Structure formats: C-alpha cells, structure tokens
Amino acid sequence: MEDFVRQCFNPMIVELAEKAMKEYGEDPKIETNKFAAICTHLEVCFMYSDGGSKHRFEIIEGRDRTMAWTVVNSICNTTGVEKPKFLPDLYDYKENRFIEIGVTRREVHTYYLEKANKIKSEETHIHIFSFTGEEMATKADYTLDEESRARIKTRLFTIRQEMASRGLWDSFRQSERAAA
Ligand SMILES: [Mn+2]
Ligand SMILES: [Mn+2]
C-alpha cells in the first residue's frame, strides 16, 4: 500500500501526509491505510478549494497547526463568525462559514453524524464524500456546482478501483471500521 500511495498522489500531498502522521507519532510505513486516507483527504480538500471562484476559499487543511489556528483566528476576528472547537478544512468567503470536509469508506450519514456530534457547531458546514459517489452536506447545501463535486466523486472512485486492482481495497475499507 505504501508504494501504491507514493505513485497515486502527488509528492506535495505525500509530504504533507507524512508530516501529519509524524506529529501524531504514526509511522506511514506501518499504518499505510491511514497514510492513504490522509493523502485522499488532502487531495479532496485541495480539489474542493479549486472548485470555486479564485478567491472563494481560505485553505486551512495542509497548514502547520499553529499557523492554521492563527488564520482561523484572523477569520473569526474579522467576520464575527464563531470560533471552531476543532480545526476545520476551509473557510468559504462567499457563504461566510467554515467547512469540514469528510471522506469515508463507511456510510455518509454515519460519518456525517459523528462529525456533527464531535464539532458541536451551528455554523460550521459539513460536507462528506464517499468512495461510492455519495455525498451529504449540511442542509443539503453542497456549496460547489455539480461539475466540481462530480470530479471529486470520479477521482475517489478511481482510487477505490486502483486499490481493488492491487488487492488493497478490502483492507483499506475495513481499516476505518476497526478504527471507529
Ligand atoms: Mn480536517
Ligand atoms: Mn476534514
């Protein structure tokens, strides 16, 4: 799975995923399913931010934690928006809300509810994607146009297929279940 990951995702994403795992004492060489999952989440977040007009989104995911919180603080102080209890992934300047992006090998609603109960926010928008083409978002407000979401859905299905091709999909799907 480690070698698959390193040829599936761009080096910039792979590098960000390794840094994030080390900060949590996780070895990318051993917890390779987590490694794939983290890269996938990064790629989706970056694809999503590209789906809007040029200036639309502040990107929080992929930043160093301290600077991430600094940018979050800048947004909150300048917009009035409630400060999230956990680091969100993007801030949407058009809709004026933080966005938590999820990617799940489980059902979208199960994951959605876990995320909603965790963050405890009446403001932060939640948008969940699956490896089956399903999506679920706060109030059925999907933020992006259909085209931008579809591209993301397509990419996730390709990753799933590329994994299944190598006999890695079953283990990858099961890993999230065991973790939860
Ligand atoms: Mn996140
Ligand atoms: Mn996320």
Author numbering: 1 to 50, 50A, 50B, 50C, 73 to 196, 196A, 196B, 196C
Share the article's original sentences.
The RdRp is a heterotrimeric complex comprising subunits PA, PB1, and PB2 that associates with the 3′ and 5′ ends of each RNA genome segment. Here, we present crystal structures of PAN from strain A/Vietnam/1203/2004 (H5N1) in complex with six known or predicted inhibitors that allow us to precisely describe their interactions with the PAN active site.
Previous structural studies raised the question as to whether there is a single Mg2+ ion or two Mn2+ ions in the PAN active site. We eventually modeled two Mn2+ ions into the active sites of all of our structures for the following reasons. ΔLoop–Apo crystals soaked in a solution containing only 5 mM MnCl2 revealed strong electron density in both metal sites. Second, refinements of all our structures consistently favored Mn2+ over Mg2+ ions to account for the observed electron densities. ΔLoop–Apo and move to 3.8–4.0 Å apart when an inhibitor is bound. This mobility seems to occur in Mn2 because Mn1 is in a similar location in both the unbound and inhibitor-bound structures. Our data suggest that the inhibitor-bound form of PAN represents the enzyme-substrate complex stage in which the metals are separated by about 4.0 Å. PAN contains a large, deep active site (over 3000 Å3) with several ordered water molecules, 17 of which are found in at least three of the four PAN molecules in the asymmetric unit.
